[PDB]
Amino acid sequence: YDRGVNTFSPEGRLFQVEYAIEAIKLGSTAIGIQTSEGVCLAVEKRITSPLMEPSSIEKIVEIDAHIGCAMSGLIADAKTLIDKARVETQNHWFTYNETMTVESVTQAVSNLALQFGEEDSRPFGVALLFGGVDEKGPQLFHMDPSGTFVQCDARAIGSASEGAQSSLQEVYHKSMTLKEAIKSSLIILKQVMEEKLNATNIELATVQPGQNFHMFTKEELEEVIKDI
């Protein structure tokens, strides 16, 4: 009845790596868009109760001054991968006296993502987006529970993933601006979420080449909502 945690399918993939891909269809949806002006990156919060404090939860968190993140699926084991990414960028700064690029952050986490076993215990049930501006311009990456990462241009991750990815292929082009890429993503989040969109259900964060990682707050955010 009971397999191990390390068993191939007769079709050949695995079992619990494929099971963890199912687990990230229960998290809140998240949208990131790479634009040559900069990377915009948004999420919903999925507020359960009126008594809940809304700002205590977060999905966007920063790794460095020029790299942000966005998480989905489970949350409690996402905090392990965020802390490994923060230490990795500081060891690179310590020994090389420069900033680690956005791609080489991602493979440092992706090498950690498939290391469970019965020596030295289960894969991570999260899915991540990495927005950053290195010396090659703005970048956007997306890893997996399987440890597979690839550069995207506009990726939608969460429970409403394939519904948003269809509506995101029709609005994106290579010559967007950052002021309208922000407005384009909130239209997609307005369609897919349950409750009505306000200044508390969501939050955004952008990174530009000029300034560092900036996260919006409840004063400069609702001008985009009222001018949607």
Partner: protein
């Protein structure tokens, strides 16, 4: 080759290839490829059989499970 006798088979067939992409089959499953390839061509309206009709017949006899797997390589 025996059960492909009565079917309109174009001379684009390499049975030495077809015997080699079908491993671990038996005499029933090798017979079952010839009937399934003879029905996929009826879907697309073709009258002769081509090599890709057999290769699609093999995927039906193996009875694989389709789960969204294109993230390798």
């Amino acid at each position: 080759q025996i059960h492909s006798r009565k079917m309109n088979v174009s001379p684009d067939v390499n049975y030495e290839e077809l015997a080699r992409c079908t491993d671990d089959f038996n005499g029933a499953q090798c017979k079952a490829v010839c009937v399934e390839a003879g029905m996929i061509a009826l879907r697309r309206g073709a009258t002769e059989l081509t090599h890709e009709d057999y290769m699609e017949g093999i995927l039906e006899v193996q009875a694989k499970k389709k789960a969204n797997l294109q993230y390798y390589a």
